[PDB]
Design an enzyme around this catalytic site. Structure first.
Site, PDB file in Angstrom:
ATOM      1  N   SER A  63       0.760  -1.218   0.000  1.00 60.64           N
ATOM      2  CA  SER A  63       0.000   0.000   0.000  1.00 60.64           C
ATOM      3  C   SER A  63       0.809   1.295   0.000  1.00 60.64           C
ATOM      4  O   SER A  63       0.208   2.378  -0.197  1.00 60.64           O
ATOM      5  CB  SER A  63      -0.960   0.020   1.203  1.00 60.64           C
ATOM      6  OG  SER A  63      -1.920  -1.034   1.085  1.00 60.64           O
ATOM      7  N   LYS A  66       0.190   3.622  -2.868  1.00 61.24           N
ATOM      8  CA  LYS A  66      -0.798   4.698  -2.880  1.00 61.24           C
ATOM      9  C   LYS A  66      -0.177   6.096  -2.825  1.00 61.24           C
ATOM     10  O   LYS A  66      -0.786   7.063  -3.253  1.00 61.24           O
ATOM     11  CB  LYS A  66      -1.739   4.533  -1.691  1.00 61.24           C
ATOM     12  CG  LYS A  66      -2.674   3.342  -1.775  1.00 61.24           C
ATOM     13  CD  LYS A  66      -3.604   3.243  -0.600  1.00 61.24           C
ATOM     14  CE  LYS A  66      -4.607   2.128  -0.669  1.00 61.24           C
ATOM     15  NZ  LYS A  66      -4.050   0.816  -0.234  1.00 61.24           N
ATOM     16  N   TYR A 149     -10.680   3.251   4.923  1.00 56.91           N
ATOM     17  CA  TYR A 149      -9.533   2.911   4.079  1.00 56.91           C
ATOM     18  C   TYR A 149      -9.942   1.834   3.084  1.00 56.91           C
ATOM     19  O   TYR A 149     -10.477   0.796   3.463  1.00 56.91           O
ATOM     20  CB  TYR A 149      -8.377   2.422   4.928  1.00 56.91           C
ATOM     21  CG  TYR A 149      -7.071   2.162   4.219  1.00 56.91           C
ATOM     22  CD1 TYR A 149      -6.131   3.184   4.066  1.00 56.91           C
ATOM     23  CD2 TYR A 149      -6.766   0.891   3.712  1.00 56.91           C
ATOM     24  CE1 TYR A 149      -4.940   2.936   3.420  1.00 56.91           C
ATOM     25  CE2 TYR A 149      -5.559   0.661   3.063  1.00 56.91           C
ATOM     26  CZ  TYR A 149      -4.658   1.684   2.910  1.00 56.91           C
ATOM     27  OH  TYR A 149      -3.442   1.478   2.294  1.00 56.91           O
ATOM     28  N   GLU A 274      -0.439  10.017   4.739  1.00 53.71           N
ATOM     29  CA  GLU A 274      -1.104  10.400   5.956  1.00 53.71           C
ATOM     30  C   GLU A 274      -0.170  11.205   6.845  1.00 53.71           C
ATOM     31  O   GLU A 274       1.049  11.018   6.750  1.00 53.71           O
ATOM     32  CB  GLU A 274      -1.616   9.164   6.712  1.00 53.71           C
ATOM     33  CG  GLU A 274      -2.614   8.380   5.852  1.00 53.71           C
ATOM     34  CD  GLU A 274      -3.025   7.049   6.410  1.00 53.71           C
ATOM     35  OE1 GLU A 274      -2.898   6.868   7.649  1.00 53.71           O
ATOM     36  OE2 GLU A 274      -3.489   6.154   5.664  1.00 53.71           O
ATOM     37  N   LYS A 317       3.412   6.284   5.635  1.00 51.86           N
ATOM     38  CA  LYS A 317       2.564   5.272   5.054  1.00 51.86           C
ATOM     39  C   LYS A 317       3.150   3.885   5.303  1.00 51.86           C
ATOM     40  O   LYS A 317       4.341   3.680   5.095  1.00 51.86           O
ATOM     41  CB  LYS A 317       2.435   5.428   3.547  1.00 51.86           C
ATOM     42  CG  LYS A 317       1.383   4.576   2.889  1.00 51.86           C
ATOM     43  CD  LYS A 317      -0.043   4.954   3.274  1.00 51.86           C
ATOM     44  CE  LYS A 317      -1.159   4.125   2.695  1.00 51.86           C
ATOM     45  NZ  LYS A 317      -1.297   2.845   3.473  1.00 51.86           N
ATOM     46  N   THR A 318       2.291   2.981   5.743  1.00 48.81           N
ATOM     47  CA  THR A 318       2.614   1.564   5.819  1.00 48.81           C
ATOM     48  C   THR A 318       2.125   0.837   4.570  1.00 48.81           C
ATOM     49  O   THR A 318       1.153   1.273   3.944  1.00 48.81           O
ATOM     50  CB  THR A 318       1.856   0.891   6.988  1.00 48.81           C
ATOM     51  OG1 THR A 318       0.455   1.198   6.913  1.00 48.81           O
ATOM     52  CG2 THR A 318       2.322   1.379   8.362  1.00 48.81           C
ATOM     53  N   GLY A 319       2.802  -0.255   4.229  1.00 51.51           N
ATOM     54  CA  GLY A 319       2.285  -1.057   3.130  1.00 51.51           C
ATOM     55  C   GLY A 319       2.775  -2.483   3.246  1.00 51.51           C
ATOM     56  O   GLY A 319       3.926  -2.721   3.651  1.00 51.51           O
ATOM     57  N   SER A 320       1.915  -3.420   2.892  1.00 53.62           N
ATOM     58  CA  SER A 320       2.215  -4.851   2.975  1.00 53.62           C
ATOM     59  C   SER A 320       1.705  -5.587   1.759  1.00 53.62           C
ATOM     60  O   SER A 320       0.740  -5.141   1.129  1.00 53.62           O
ATOM     61  CB  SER A 320       1.599  -5.445   4.229  1.00 53.62           C
ATOM     62  OG  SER A 320       1.992  -4.745   5.409  1.00 53.62           O
TER      63      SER A 320
END
Ligand SMILES: *C(=O)C1=CN=C(C(=O)O)CS[C@H]1c1cn2c(n1)COCC2
Length: 363
Positions: A63, A66, A149, A274, A317-320
């Site tokens: 993510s 994004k 989200y 964010e 931002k986190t993403g996995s």
């Protein structure tokens, strides 16, 4: 101030226990400090083949993709191709259901359309079926009232935002964002010659990599960005310091993506990015990262007009993906930032805690 020697110790002393505790095979970290990236690599990109992580190893961003979408959409706004205040239907006239009246491009981009779900369902296999999905959708909330989200929200924003350009998402992104920033090893589709650099992800001991979705308006964006720690460092630097980005629309797009559109408790929603006001304590950021909070439908307060970027912000931002876990955070006032790329998806609170600890050492 902290020396490079001291910073290297902080990173190793933070990352090594984290990788042990969370069973992480490999990690690439960059810290942005004193105007340049500093790179630290740990472990294995491919356990069976005994390949180490290097600054060229490709990781799945999940993510954090994004953020690229958000900046690309900002660039399109700055070119005059779209406006966040336009109705979604301006860019998709075939979307005739009246539940869409009053839903803006902004609502798609910032998850406030009124309950678009987290996922686009697998039944959606082409544009005809994507249309049927959105036409059938019944909003649980009025627009501009609840943040939920959702890939089905920002993914549609990305698809529609590039329409006036005439390019599909992958080509628009590469042409307007990646290439100008010299992110030349950032991919949706990893070229065959680049494959030797692609890490394996790990999930419960199994080596895994991202799949694709069905062809359509969302394919490239869903397949998600893959990049190495150098390109990601330079992505963070561009977003931290857009004053150094020469292309006028891209500079503006970066700022638009870090503008505040909504307030939700202690955070603010950008385009992809964010933000929280800086200073912020670790527990605020860590607790907000738990999926029970991050995926919940929460009431919003409109920021009208949107607030331009606040330098005293924690931007993140986190993403996995199935096999990968990544995190990026930066603080423009302080001109520090961090990128943590890993080939296991370990808990988001743990990512934030480690990132916070490292950046705390540098203020
Ligand atoms: C982003 O990182 C992200 C996107 N959205 C979803 C989703 O659509 O189900 C869940 S939160 C998160 C994510 C996506 N995946 C994971 N986490 C774990 O691996 C599978 C894909």
């Amino acid at each position: 101030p902290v020396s490079e020697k001291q910073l290297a110790e902080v990173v190793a002393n933070t990352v090594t226990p984290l990788m042990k505790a969370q069973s992480v095979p490999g990690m690439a970290v960059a810290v942005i400090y004193q105007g340049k990236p500093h790179y630290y690599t740990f472990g294995k990109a491919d356990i069976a083949a005994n390949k180490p992580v290097t600054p060229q190893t490709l990781f799945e961003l999940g993510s954090i993709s994004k953020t690229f979408t958000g900046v690309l959409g900002g660039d399109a706004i700055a070119r005059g191709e779209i406006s966040l205040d336009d109705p979604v239907t301006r860019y998709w006239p075939q979307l005739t259901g009246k539940q869409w009246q009053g839903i803006r491009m902004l609502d798609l981009a910032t998850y406030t359309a009124g309950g678009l779900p987290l996922q686009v369902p697998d039944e959606v296999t082409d544009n005809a079926s994507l249309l049927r999905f959105y036409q059938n959708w019944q909003p649980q909330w009025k627009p501009g009232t609840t943040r939920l989200y959702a890939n089905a929200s920002i993914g549609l924003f990305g698809a529609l935002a590039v329409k006036p350009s005439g390019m599909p998402y992958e080509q628009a992104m590469t042409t307007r964002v990646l290439k100008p920033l010299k992110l030349d090893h950032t991919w949706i589709n990893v070229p065959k010659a680049e494959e030797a650099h692609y890490a394996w992800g790990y999930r419960d001991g199994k080596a895994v990599r991202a799949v694709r979705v069905s062809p359509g308006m969302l394919d490239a964006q869903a397949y998600g960005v893959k990049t190495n720690v150098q390109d990601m460092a330079n992505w963070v630097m561009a977003n931290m310091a857009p004053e150094n980005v020469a292309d006028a629309s891209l500079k503006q797009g970066i700022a638009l993506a870090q503008s505040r559109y909504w307030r939700i408790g202690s955070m603010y929603q950008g385009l992809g990015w964010e933000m929280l006001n800086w200073p912020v304590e670790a527990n605020t950021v860590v607790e907000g990262s738990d999926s029970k909070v991050a995926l919940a439908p929460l009431p919003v307060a409109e920021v009208n007009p949107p607030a331009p970027p606040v330098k005293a912000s924690w931007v993140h931002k986190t993403g996995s993906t199935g096999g990968f876990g990544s995190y990026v955070a930066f603080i423009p006032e302080k001109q520090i930032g961090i990128v943590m790329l890993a080939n296991t998806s370990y808990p988001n609170p743990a990512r934030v805690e480690a990132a916070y600890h490292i950046l705390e050492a540098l203020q």
